Every structure is written in structure tokens, then in C-alpha cells.
UniProtKB/Swiss-Prot annotation:
Name of the protein in question: Mitogen-activated protein kinase 14
This protein's UniProt keywords: Acetylation, Apoptosis, ATP-binding, Cytoplasm, Kinase, Nucleotide-binding, Nucleus, Phosphoprotein, Serine/threonine-protein kinase, Stress response, Transcription, Transcription regulation, Transferase, Ubl conjugation
Function, in words: Serine/threonine kinase which acts as an essential component of the MAP kinase signal transduction pathway. MAPK14 is one of the four p38 MAPKs which play an important role in the cascades of cellular responses evoked by extracellular stimuli such as pro-inflammatory cytokines or physical stress leading to direct activation of transcription factors. Accordingly, p38 MAPKs phosphorylate a broad range of proteins and it has been estimated that they may have approximately 200 to 300 substrates each.
Catalytic activity: L-seryl-[protein] + ATP = O-phospho-L-seryl-[protein] + ADP + H(+); L-threonyl-[protein] + ATP = O-phospho-L-threonyl-[protein] + ADP + H(+)
Cofactor: Mg(2+)
Single GO MF annotation: mitogen-activated protein kinase p38 binding
Amino acid sequence: RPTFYRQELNKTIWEVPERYQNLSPVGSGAYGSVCAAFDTKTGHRVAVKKLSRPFQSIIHAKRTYRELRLLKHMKHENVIGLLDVFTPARSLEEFNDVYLVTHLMGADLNNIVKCQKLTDDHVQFLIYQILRGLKYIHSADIIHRDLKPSNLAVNEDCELKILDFGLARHTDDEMTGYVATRWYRAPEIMLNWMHYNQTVDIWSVGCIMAELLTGRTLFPGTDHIDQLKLILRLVGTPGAELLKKISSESARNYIQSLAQMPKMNFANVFIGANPLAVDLLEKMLVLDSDKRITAAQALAHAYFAQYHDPDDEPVADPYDQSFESRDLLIDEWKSLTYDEVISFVPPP
Ligand SMILES: NNC(=O)c1ccc(-c2ccc(Cl)cc2)o1
Ligand SMILES: [Cl-]
Ligand SMILES: [Cl-]
Ligand SMILES: [Cl-]
Ligand SMILES: [Cl-]
Ligand SMILES: [Cl-]
Ligand SMILES: [Mg+2]
């Protein structure tokens, strides 16, 4: 067991191993507080996140266990990994606090979209890396659920990592009105007309790719209905083949009210873009999710010819998510979390 030291930073007690020095607050949501630190064991600048109220309810205790399981599993160059996890508790009986340690990220994709002149080569390399990471995530039967520019870390060498997996955290208030939190969601998820599946992440990749090519949000809706109208004007209203599949009475009802529109010509929307970029966007931005390109299929598209290496696009170890359908008490979720903290082995 390492030695721990205590300090107060912005009205919060931080108790951390001596290896972590020069702690400085960086931000805080309702999920926890975050400090930047220097890790003397590894030489890395790190983010230390102290969870807030990790075991306050059954829903909160399960969410804590879900986040720790997911971060312990992810071992890939284009996905955030777990450097360390610790608790100052010496036993299950005094266990209350959980701290998570990752590499400190600087710029997100939001920063480089607003500010930099992107070549076609930049767009190829950035979207290649998102798809390489997503092939890995989807091979474990994990859905990200919240891909958007602020959840993509990028360095000076244009190297990218996926972060901030959806933990089923977002509220109705957070999705309301003119908000980036909704602009990258697939239309069938927008109003819960279908259950989440991994094809929803490819829709988000299409919205990010369009925004790197134009410098502008693809579907900046002022509310759910305005955003659906922007989507259907580009990709067309449902055809007979898709209508047949639509199980939700709610959806077919509102959709039959709208005048029919054809799919637009994407070469006239994305003026001057590489024709191979236009072709790949037509394969991602398909209303019928069964017909979208997969991450594994997209990596072999001629747009990525310069970067594609089928011997260096790895898949994940199997991931057991059976806990998701399990009914447990707060203290049982807390005991499972404690076992995962004490069994952690750091990376090489
Ligand atoms: N396999 N797909 C489906 O079961 C499904 C159910 C609902 C939809 C859907 C897609 C776009 C709009 Cl606008 C409305 C509904 O797709
Ligand atoms: Cl230490
Ligand atoms: Cl990492
Ligand atoms: Cl504790
Ligand atoms: Cl964003
Ligand atoms: Cl597993
Ligand atoms: Mg985020």
C-alpha cells in the first residue's frame, strides 16, 4: 500500500498517493471533480478524477461499477485507457471514495475544427483513427452512445483518442433546444423510436466528418423536430422498405404527416470535397440503420488507402456485460467495485 497525503482544493478533501504531485483543479461536473497532476512514477502529466457520491443510490453505485469495468477493459491506441485507480480505504468497511487516473488531454476536435485550415489529408487521418478505435470498441459489443467533437482528444501530431463513453448519464434538460449534446445523435434515437445499437455511432462519425470538411455543424437543430426536418431534407423521408420495419406507432404517426422528400445530391452539398469523401458520407448517413456501413467495412474504403493496414487494426478481448441485467443492493455493487479497485494491474 502506498503512503497517502491530504489537501483541500476548492472546498474538496483530496487524499492521494505521494507519487501524484502539484495537484491543480481543472473542472467539475455532477459526476466528480478533476485535478491535473504530475505522476512521479511514470513521468506523465495526468488527470485525477475524484468521483462525487459514488454509492449514494442503487443507480449511482451501478454507474460507478459500469464506468470502472469499461475503463479497465479499454486497451487501444485510439481509446482512453486507465493509468491507475485508488482508494485511501484500508478495508471494504471504511470504503467510500474512488479516484480514476488517465493521461491529461489538451485540445479536443472542437478546438481544431474552429481554428485550423484542414487539408483532405488531415480529414483522412482523423476519421481513420476514430474508425480504428470504433472497430475495437464495437468488437467488444460496447456502444459509445455520445461521439461528438468534445469527446475526441487530438495532439500537435494530429493523433486522436476517443473518450467520455456514454454511461447512460444525459438528462432530458441536457438534450433540449439549440445544443451540441443532440446535434450528432441518429434520428431514430432522438425521440427513443428504437433501442440503442452500435450503428448509432457510425451516424455520429458521418456528422463529425461533414463538419471537418465544411467547418460547419451538419444538423444544428433548434429542437428535436427542427433537427429531424434538417436530417430528412438531406437524406430523404423513409422509403416503403424502411416504413415496413418501423415498429414504433409514435414514429409512423408523425412521419406520415410530413410531405415526401428525395435524398439530395451530396456532391452539390459538399462542394469541392474529394469524391471518395462524398461516397463514404453517403454510406454512413443512411436513415435505415441496418444499411449503414460498419467501422470494419469503412476501414477498407478507398478514402483511407494511404493509412489502412489490416494487420494493425486490432479487435478487443471479450467483454462480459451480464452485470447490466442483474438486480443487486447498494452494498453488493459497492463490494464488486472494491474488488475491481484492488485487482487493478497497471499497464507496462
Ligand atoms: N431497422 N430500423 C428500425 O427498426 C427503425 C425503427 C425506427 C426507425 C427510424 C429511422 C428514421 C426515422 Cl426518421 C424514424 C424511424 O428505424
Ligand atoms: Cl506513492
Ligand atoms: Cl490512454
Ligand atoms: Cl475511502
Ligand atoms: Cl461537441
Ligand atoms: Cl470481461
Ligand atoms: Mg465530454
